[PDB]
């Protein structure tokens, strides 16, 4: 099914932002991006700059399959999660 890649990406974003898990990347900060569809490249470019972590490693691979101010990785992933769910609903799987 062609919605599998996005479904799995969404599901990974959820897994790594569970309340139980520690604050993502120890509160490292990344460039915020404009979430407007076809933003997978830009999202990868923000995340690939976070060295180590490992918690976002799977998200980084997942974004690869798709490809002026800073915010916490936690907030970045949560805002991206919400956006992708809306894309999923509208049938944008690419």
């Amino acid at each position: 099914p062609p919605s599998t890649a996005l479904r799995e990406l969404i599901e990974e974003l959820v897994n790594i932002t569970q309340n139980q898990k520690a604050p993502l990347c120890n509160g490292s900060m990344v460039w915020s991006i404009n979430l407007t569809a076809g933003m997978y490249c830009a999202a990868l470019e923000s995340l690939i700059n976070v060295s180590g972590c490992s918690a976002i490693e799977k998200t980084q691979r997942m974004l690869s399959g798709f490809c002026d101010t800073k915010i916490e990785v936690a907030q970045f992933v949560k805002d991206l999660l919400l956006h992708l769910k809306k894309l999923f609903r509208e049938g944008r799987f690419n």
């Epitope: 969404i10 599901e11 569970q18």
Partner: antibody, heavy 121, light 108 residues
């Protein structure tokens, strides 16, 4: 922007009811309608969805076979017919605006005021 | 797909009420919330996890993470007494799922 529902109906067991829902203030055929019922003092139950664009339908699993949804574009009206009625179909039947998409179901922003159907011998 | 709500929540006037909606990876779904008073149709209060339609008080907010979505109502009033229903779309056998409903009692 409103959904206008037909009046309360009293029906015998085994009869059929057709409830109407008229749309006002928006472009009817750019959306869908979901039907949701509620037996008195109980929860919401989704009955199905119809596209006002093409008349495609998707019925709730518990209602497959028993329900028919139709639209009349000329009057911006949707119809829900429930057949082979039983005492346990006594409920308020609501129509609500939904997306015209056959892929995804959306939130229900606009609701009709509901039509009580009482099923009694 | 199954949504689970507590049947009831009680709250004192002016306090904050929290209503949960549990489902497996509900965080991966867009959650909507309806308020319903007796004799009236449901009213959409929160859509897409945490957005408010126009005319809904800013006292209403929504969160969705992991296996739990939450509707929060700050500074509760007697006019907030109602049944609250969470709702999702699912790609499986039931395309629309409602939670069982939570009765919010405001202890006046």
């Amino acid at each position: 922007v409103q959904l206008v529902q037909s009046g309360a109906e009293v029906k015998k067991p085994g009869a059929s009811v057709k409830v109407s829902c008229k749309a006002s203030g928006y472009t009817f055929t750019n959306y869908g309608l979901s039907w949701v019922r509620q037996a008195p003092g109980q929860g919401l139950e989704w009955m199905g969805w119809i596209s006002a664009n093409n008349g495609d339908t998707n019925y709730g699993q518990e209602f497959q076979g028993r329900v028919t949804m139709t639209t009349d574009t000329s009057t911006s009206t949707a119809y829900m017919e429930l057949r082979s009625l039983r005492s346990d179909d006594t409920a308020v039947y609501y129509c609500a605006r939904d997306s015209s998409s056959s892929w995804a179901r959306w939130f229900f922003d606009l609701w009709g005021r509901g039509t009580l159907v009482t099923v009694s011998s | 797909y199954v949504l689970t709500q507590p049947p009831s929540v009680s709250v004192a006037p002016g306090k904050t009420a929290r209503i949960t909606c549990g489902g497996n990876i509900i965080g991966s779904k867009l959650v909507h919330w309806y308020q319903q008073k007796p004799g009236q149709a449901p009213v959409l209060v929160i859509y897409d996890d945490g957005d408010r339609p126009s005319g809904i008080p800013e006292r209403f907010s929504g969160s969705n993470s992991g296996n739990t979505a939450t509707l929060t109502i700050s500074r509760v009033e007697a006019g907030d007494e109602a049944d609250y229903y969470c709702q999702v779309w699912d790609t499986g056998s039931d395309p629309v799922v409602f939670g069982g409903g939570t009765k919010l009692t405001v202890l006046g």
